[PDB]
Amino acid sequence: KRILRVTFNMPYGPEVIREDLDVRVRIMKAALRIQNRATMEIFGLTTQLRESLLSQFTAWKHRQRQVGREDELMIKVSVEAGYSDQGREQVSRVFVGEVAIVDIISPPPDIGIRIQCYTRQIDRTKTIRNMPPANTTFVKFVEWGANEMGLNFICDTSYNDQVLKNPGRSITVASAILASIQDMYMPDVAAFVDDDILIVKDRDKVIRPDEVTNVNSFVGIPSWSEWGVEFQCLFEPSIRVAGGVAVESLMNPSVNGNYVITALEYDLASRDRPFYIKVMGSPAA
Amino acid sequence: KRILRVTFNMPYGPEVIREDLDVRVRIMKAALRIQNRATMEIFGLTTQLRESLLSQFTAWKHRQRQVGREDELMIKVSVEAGYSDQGREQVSRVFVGEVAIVDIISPPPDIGIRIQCYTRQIDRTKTIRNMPPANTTFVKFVEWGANEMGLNFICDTSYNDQVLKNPGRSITVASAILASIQDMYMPDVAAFVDDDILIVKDRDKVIRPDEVTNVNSFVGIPSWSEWGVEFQCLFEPSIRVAGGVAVESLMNPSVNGNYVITALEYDLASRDRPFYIKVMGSPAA
Amino acid sequence: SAKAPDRTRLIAALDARSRRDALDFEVMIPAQVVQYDRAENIATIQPLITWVDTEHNAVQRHQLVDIPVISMGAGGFHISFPIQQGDIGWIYAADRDTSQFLESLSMSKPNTGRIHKFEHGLFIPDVFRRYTINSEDSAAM
């Protein structure tokens, strides 16, 4: 009994699209600069709901007009998925971001929309309000970037106490901040934004070491990869990105060990078979 | 009765490939610097027709030989499509361009070629014969580019009387002229080439205000999009690129209004179901 | 900053990617000096070419600090000028971070991965037309 909700944020309020409507969310997240994506195929829309949603989702009013100083320029939508049995719920949060693309995939008799949301699509920000530090340490540049983007930060790396001269004075917008933080020191320590938290950590270290996820049931088989172990699983509302995993396989006994998560491929369909999440993991140090 | 013709231009003359042969033309046009594309799969070619066409289509005689000073270097082919009933024809023109690629997709017993043409594939032109202006206005640079390319021009923009110091003396060939005109002033005013007419205008303005196309019948449903309205229709020989459209929908009442065209996707199959044109449109100002 | 018929053909996204990758490729622009000291030859610099947004507004670039200033010297025979705040010139960009090279003046690694940015570069002074040449010195250095 999968329970999947797509919650928009609109001037009227939140209009939650439940799992009764045919919905299909393909989220793909990674420990990269690039904004994590979520494609949303939603069918069964009424005329009123289509008017209330698609008309608000637009790329105008910031190009041929002005109507922009803060948020409400583009609609922010979150995704809450999970399971529910015996009356209890498991609705976690799996994506927060603003819509960028909107098309239609299925014509009548089932008018189904397909939107494309991206995390931190508010690169329509205020062109960097506070100037970046002139000479400062890496953790301090990270703190400035987090404060500029408005997100709380988790910075855990061994490169924090390294000074930089002009760390990002060429930055043009807030989104480019993450690009700069990713650009400097990129063999291991890659920074990203997971939902509302900006994470800057080494690629071989776990963000929350006490939050290891012991994994014993898999769909298919936990197989090797040129980096670590890769495996698909049924939706567990406790697996984030950059988290620690404690794979204990049966089919492949050599893949057992502790791994950190680098990528994540959510594929959630209320009215269809795919309700999986795919994990790319690398050896954890 | 759909009537679709592919008319080549070769030294012998025009050899019209009619709709009796299995022809499938996918044309994709847009208001960009990019050359609009036409992929046409033609089956039922005789040996003689294959030798008369494919042998002429080549990328040699301009790389390992000379045989070149003007046209006849590459075969220019036009596409004329439409409907016909009660004896009256509706054959308009939907593409003019030179072939670039030749292949076969379907092996025997149906030897069917697949050839790829782009508009203005004469980019290996006379390496800019007339020098670009030293200091001039945008309209006059556009006129110089149109004169160099040999195409008549439609320049309708509010940036015409803006002087440019030094407009495009880094241009190497005739094709890069369009890329340059596109490069300067590119929030809205994007220049393109439709058939043999070079259009330079603002993106929110129509080439011919008196030539709005009232649309009432669609295939599927006219849906919203990021910019404007997107919709598919049966082939109407009155819809061009960047033309004005007057969408009047039934399923979606909110998409009614006047739109300009940005992208066009012709898919014409004489002996198959797809005979539609897909229109991307944005609000018209 | 985008166009509607992008996201339709692959080459549309590809050339948009090329444009955005070449827009961040900082090489050289005119610039002005806000601070300078002749003892260390490093100047705080404000670039003189604005960024422009969608609404057609100029957002001023950020001041760049500790930019080495050229001196055109070899064998110790350098040339100096009274670099004061307000003079204009041209600022360049380094292929890699030269912050670690600046303090050492020797073979050093790039401190960070920032490639082709105005954060690290030079500033060659240039007076442009702001001078007067006597008629007697027509063909004369």
């Binding site: 904004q35 699509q121 | - | 985008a2 053909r9 692959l10 549309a12 590809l14 948009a16 990617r17 827009l23």
Partner: peptide
């Protein structure tokens, strides 16, 4: 999918500053 990859490619080339 080709279309989703194309749209993702188009996304990261849109910031306010034209040039």
């Amino acid at each position: 999918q080709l279309t989703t990859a194309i749209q993702d490619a188009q996304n990261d080339s849109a910031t306010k500053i034209l040039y």
